[PDB]
Amino acid sequence: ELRDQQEQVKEDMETKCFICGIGSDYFDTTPHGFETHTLEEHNLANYM
Amino acid sequence: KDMVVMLLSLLEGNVVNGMIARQMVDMLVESSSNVEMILKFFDMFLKLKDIVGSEAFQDYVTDPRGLISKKDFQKAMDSQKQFTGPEIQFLLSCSEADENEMINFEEFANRFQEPARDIGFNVAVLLTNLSEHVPHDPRLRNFLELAESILEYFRPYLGRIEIMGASRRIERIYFEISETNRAQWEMPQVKESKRQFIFDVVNEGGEAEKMELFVSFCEDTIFEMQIAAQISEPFWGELEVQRVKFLNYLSRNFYTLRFLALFLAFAINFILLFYKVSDSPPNMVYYFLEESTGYMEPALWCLSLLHTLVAFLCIIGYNCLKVPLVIFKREKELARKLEFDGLYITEQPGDDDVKGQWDRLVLNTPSFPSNYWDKFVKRKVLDKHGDIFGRERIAELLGMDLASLEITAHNERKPDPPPGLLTWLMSIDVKYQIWKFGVIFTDNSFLYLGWYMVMSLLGHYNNFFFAAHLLDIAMGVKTLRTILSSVTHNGKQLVMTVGLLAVVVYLYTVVAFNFFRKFYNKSEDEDEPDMKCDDMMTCYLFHMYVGVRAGGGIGDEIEDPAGDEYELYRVVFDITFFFFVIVILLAIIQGLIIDAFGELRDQQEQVKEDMETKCFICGIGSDYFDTTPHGFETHTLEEHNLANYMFFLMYLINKDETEHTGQESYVWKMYQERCWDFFPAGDCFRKQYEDQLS
Amino acid sequence: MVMSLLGHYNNFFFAAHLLDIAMGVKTLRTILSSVTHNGKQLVMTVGLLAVVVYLYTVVAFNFFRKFYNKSEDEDEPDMKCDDMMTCYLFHMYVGVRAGGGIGDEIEDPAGDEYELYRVVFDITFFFFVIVILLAIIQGLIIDAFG
Amino acid sequence: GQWDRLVLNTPSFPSNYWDKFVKRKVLDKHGDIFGRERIAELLGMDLAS
Ligand SMILES: Nc1ncnc2c1ncn2[C@@H]1O[C@H](COP(=O)(O)OP(=O)(O)OP(=O)(O)O)[C@@H](O)[C@H]1O
Ligand SMILES: Nc1ncnc2c1ncn2[C@@H]1O[C@H](COP(=O)(O)OP(=O)(O)OP(=O)(O)O)[C@@H](O)[C@H]1O
Ligand SMILES: O=c1nc2[nH][nH]cc-2c(=O)[nH]1
Ligand SMILES: [Ca+2]
Ligand SMILES: [Zn+2]
Ligand SMILES: [Zn+2]
Numbered sequence: 030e031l032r033d034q035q036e037q038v039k040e041d042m043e044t045k046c047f048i049c050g051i052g053s054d055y056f057d058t059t060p061h062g063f064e065t066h067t068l069e070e071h072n073l074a075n076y077m
Numbered sequence: 078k079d080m081v082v083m084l085l086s087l088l089e090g091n092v093v094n095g096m097i098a099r100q101m102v103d104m105l106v107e108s109s110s111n112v113e114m115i116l117k118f119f120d121m122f123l124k125l126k127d128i129v130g131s132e133a134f135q136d137y138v139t140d141p142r143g144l145i146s147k148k149d150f151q152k153a154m155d156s157q158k159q160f161t162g163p164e165i166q167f168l169l170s171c172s173e174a175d176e177n178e179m180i181n182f183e184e185f186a187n188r189f190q191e192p193a194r195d196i197g198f199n200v201a202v203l204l205t206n207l208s209e210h211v212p213h214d215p216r217l218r219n220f221l222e223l224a225e226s227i228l229e230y231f232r233p234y235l236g237r238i239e240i241m242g243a244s245r246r247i248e249r250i251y252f253e254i255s256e257t258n259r260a261q262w263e264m265p266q267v268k269e270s271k272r273q274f275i276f277d278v279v280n281e282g283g284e285a286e287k288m289e290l291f292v293s294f295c296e297d298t299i300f301e302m303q304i305a306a307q308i309s310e311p312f313w314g315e316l317e318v319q320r321v322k323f324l325n326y327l328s329r330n331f332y333t334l335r336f337l338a339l340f341l342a343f344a345i346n347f348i349l350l351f352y353k354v355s356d357s358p359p360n361m362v363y364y365f366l367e368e369s370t371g372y373m374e375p376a377l378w379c380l381s382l383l384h385t386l387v388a389f390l391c392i393i394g395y396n397c398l399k400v401p402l403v404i405f406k407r408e409k410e411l412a413r414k415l416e417f418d419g420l421y422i423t424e425q426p427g428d429d430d431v432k433g434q435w436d437r438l439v440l441n442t443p444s445f446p447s448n449y450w451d452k453f454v455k456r457k458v459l460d461k462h463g464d465i466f467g468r469e470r471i472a473e474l475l476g477m478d479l480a481s482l483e484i485t486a487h488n489e490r491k492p493d494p495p496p497g498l499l500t501w502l503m504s505i506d507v508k509y510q511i512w513k514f515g516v517i518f519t520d521n522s523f524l525y526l527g528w529y530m531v532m533s534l535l536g537h538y539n540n541f542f543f544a545a546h547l548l549d550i551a552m553g554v555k556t557l558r559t560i561l562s563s564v565t566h567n568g569k570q571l572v573m574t575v576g577l578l579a580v581v582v583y584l585y586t587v588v589a590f591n592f593f594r595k596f597y598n599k600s601e602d603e604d605e606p607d608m609k610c611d612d613m614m615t616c617y618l619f620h621m622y623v624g625v626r627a628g629g630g631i632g633d634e635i636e637d638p639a640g641d642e643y644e645l646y647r648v649v650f651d652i653t654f655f656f657f658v659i660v661i662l663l664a665i666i667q668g669l670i671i672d673a674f675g676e677l678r679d680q681q682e683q684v685k686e687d688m689e690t691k692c693f694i695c696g697i698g699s700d701y702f703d704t705t706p707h708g709f710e711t712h713t714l715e716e717h718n719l720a721n722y723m724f725f726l727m728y729l730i731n732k733d734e735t736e737h738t739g740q741e742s743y744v745w746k747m748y749q750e751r752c753w754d755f756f757p758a759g760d761c762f763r764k765q766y767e768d769q770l771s
Numbered sequence: 772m773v774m775s776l777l778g779h780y781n782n783f784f785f786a787a788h789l790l791d792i793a794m795g796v797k798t799l800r801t802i803l804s805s806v807t808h809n810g811k812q813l814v815m816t817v818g819l820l821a822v823v824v825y826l827y828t829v830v831a832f833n834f835f836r837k838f839y840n841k842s843e844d845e846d847e848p849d850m851k852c853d854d855m856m857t858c859y860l861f862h863m864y865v866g867v868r869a870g871g872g873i874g875d876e877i878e879d880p881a882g883d884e885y886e887l888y889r890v891v892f893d894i895t896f897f898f899f900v901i902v903i904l905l906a907i908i909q910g911l912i913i914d915a916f917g
Numbered sequence: 918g919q920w921d922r923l924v925l926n927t928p929s930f931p932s933n934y935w936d937k938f939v940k941r942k943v944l945d946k947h948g949d950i951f952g953r954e955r956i957a958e959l960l961g962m963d964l965a966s
Binding site for chain 2: 811812815818822829856871881897898903909911
């Protein structure tokens with residue numbers, strides 16, 4: 030149970046944007062789209 | 078061929094139903110008769126080359142010289158029902174029949190096979206391109222049908238990929254795959270490397286490094302193909318040719334030698350099962366075999382010598398077969414970090430990276446890129462960083478002579494290469510060799526083979542050291558390797574829980590020493606007792622040795638507490654020991670092992686489902702492609718085949734840059750700049766022309 | 772057929788037909804498929820167990836031969852580890868089946884020059900053989916169920 | 918595949934399978950290129966019948 034909790038959290042972070050909830054599949058139409066979205070567009074550190 | 082190449086250049090950057098492609102189709106229709114004549118010329122000789130090899134044709138062949146009469150050829154060819162009468166007459170005319178009307182079909186069939194190959198391939202490429210970009214012109218299906226044999230012939234060599242092109246659109250690229258490249262890609266070792274790479278990336282990789290990793294894998298695979306080609310098989314000169322023949326032999330048969338070593342170890346150990354120890358000769362004892370045959374003692378010595386020799390040969394084969402790839406990968410990563418990052422020019426790793434600190438020995442060596450293909454990495458690093466950090470400083474860092482660059486650009490020198498061992502002596506780059514040997518000695522496979530060596534040699538000092546080689550089955554057998562990985566998967570957890578068990582047993586030992594010391598008399602004697610808990614160390618040994626191994630805990634071993642002032646305290650002590658130590662902690666260990674089993678299985682399943690559900694290149698799921706029947710299968714076999722990207726990289730490397738097309742030059746430039754934006758990401762040809770195709 | 776016919780030669784060959792319940796009952800068939808699912812793994816891990824027990828047998832023969840006297844008699848001893856084959860049989864027969872490993876069967880090492888060596892021998896045998904490998908087998912069965 | 922070689926030339930190879938003309942189809946498909954008489958011997962057919 031503990032292992033699958035950790036895996037679930039990791040996959041959620043690597044698959045959806047923490048802010049807007051849009052999945053990585055939409056952003057990935059553009060190359061590295063999700064990476065740029067989570068580093069520049071909707072970075073939670075930036076909201077902080 | 079040149080004219081068809083010009084036409085293909087006209088089709089560059091051509092959309093579906095583009096007007097240049099439609100004009101090309103109208104041209105081909107306007108010259109339909111001549112195009113059909115060309116296609117009939119190609120298919121006739123393609124069919125001839127395969128007919129001459131038929132047993133039906135060989136039945137007609139009767140002359141012992143290997144010739145056939147014209148009349149026999151005439152009656153044989155029409156029996157196949159593949160040519161018309163005029164075509165058979167034309168083939169007879171083209172046959173160089175002698176005055177005796179005798180035909181050498183062996184050379185007749187092969188006469189035009191080689192001259193017509195390149196033009197045949199380009200005609201096939203042209204027809205494929207036009208068919209895929211003008212999918213709704215019925216005038217072109219006729220040409221495709223007339224070229225059906227040509228297209229079927231060149232199907233294994235017609236490589237196609239898709240890229241995100243210069244025009245911000247997905248473009249389809251057609252190129253050529255060679256027989257040698259395809260055959261090398263089909264080798265079992267290469268297929269295993271591909272499976273391992275796919276597993277690594279899909280399992281423990283992100284979506285960002287995927288294409289860089291794939292291209293690095295392609296480069297490594299190209300190098301492995303070169304090594305395989307080199308080791309493949311079809312007084313100083315004599316000894317050198319024999320030495321390289323021997324080294325290639327060891328390299329080719331490395332795995333058979335490995336299996337032979339394992340088999341020899343099993344045989345040795347089976348002999349060793351017959352050992353016996355006796356005081357009488359065959360106050361110290363004698364060890365000797367106990368068998369009736371009388372041949373086991375000689376057989377053991379012979380097998381020990383043979384096994385040591387086989388181990389040595391395995392070492393040599395490994396350093397001739399895998400070590401080149403090890404050094405290649407290391408040189409390649411070091412060079413790219415020097416150039417694109419300035420590892421030792423700007424950042425200077427901080428002594429905690431043993432790899433980076435060890436790589437400092439190779440920078441100034443004359444021969445730093447020995448296995449890596451790039452012999453101009455130092456020039457590139459200098460041209461990139463010398464202005465800002467000092468050209469002379471960079472030259473000293475990389476061991477370059479600033480004066481020699483100009484003369485090397487000026488002209489080429491042809492010195493005397495004297496084939497003498499004395500002259501070869503000083504030519505050894507000792508610093509490079511020390512670095513290379515350090516890299517090799519820090520390699521797991523080489524270390525394992527060296528340990529195999531050492532234990533095999535110690536087996537001669539004492540034959541029971543050959544028992545250690547029985548452990549080789551774990552690495553020899555993928556099944557054992559998976560099973561033992563199911564233990565090593567949670568090794569840190571296992572060590573930590575054993576430590577926790579030691580701590581809890583120590584706490585129980587403290588309690589027992591302070592209070593329950595009476596019960597630890599393990600002597601049935603009445604006048605000399607053996608108290609196991611009159612000392613911390615003795616009591617702790619006793620607990621960790623007997624209490625953990627007992628089924629019911631320490632209470633099984635120590636004395637009965639019934640009828641004592643401390644009965645309840647001691648029973649709580651015993652029950653809690655049994656529960657925390659015997660039940661819970663051993664359950665934790667077994668659970669870690671079982672969980673590792675499940676984790677490995679679900680990793681394999683995840684990789685398999687990912688491969689069977691998404692395209693490895695573009696990331697589009699199988700559900701989109703499956704709208705068309707077998708859409709995902711065709712997409713992964715024709716449109717976005719990763720083997721085709723590997724083959725395309727090989728093709729670009731081999732081809733001349735002056736001969737590169739526009740698309741090829743584009744991909745080549747972005748390859749050299751390490752920019753992977755040409756890989757179609759989230760988009761494909763079918764998606765881009767959904768409207769026109771549908 | 773063959774076992775039914777042999778049952779007339781000896782009626783106890785009819786006991787073999789009691790095994791038919793595995794194929795007769797889908798429940799038994801599923802349960803036994805839960806064992807056969809990882810049969811290659813089970814055979815391989817039993818082989819690995821044989822190898823590790825053999826390594827322990829080699830160590831015991833070379834060093835701990837004194838402790839393998841399984842005779843309460845004082846003048847005629849029964850030494851179980853004066854031979855490779857006898858010692859290996861002894862280990863694979865009693866050490867694997869013992870709850871605490873081979874140390875449960877062989878003599879006490881207290882008050883010997885090799886006490887610490889022998890206790891390490893015993894604890895490692897118990898952990899690698901009794902705990903880890905049997906846990907692997909049971910885990911293969913449970914994983915096949917899942 | 919090696920055991921199936923015993924049944925090819927049998928008079929009654931498709932006994933349970935519904936297709937009693939499989940040999941005729943195989944001959945009509947491959948006999949021109951590989952030899953009609955050779956195929957007939959392989960499948961145990963009589964070309965005259
Ligand atoms: N809004 C968001 N802001 C930041 N990260 C986000 C957001 N939504 C999703 N993520 C994901 O959170 C993940 C966590 O990023 P982070 O750099 O903290 O992890 P990491 O890989 O463990 O870090 P590092 O390797 O730099 O130590 C990112 O990889 C990203 O995919
Ligand atoms: N771009 C891609 N190129 C190739 N295969 C891809 C790609 N994307 C996904 N795949 C999937 O990778 C799978 C692996 O194919 P492969 O032929 O190597 O496997 P296999 O079935 O084990 O092989 P074989 O049975 O021929 O030995 C394919 O079935 C395919 O669905
Ligand atoms: O640009 C390259 N040049 C090469 N030569 N040999 C292998 C090469 C490669 O991957 N890339
Ligand atoms: Ca040019
Ligand atoms: Zn967002
Ligand atoms: Zn794709």
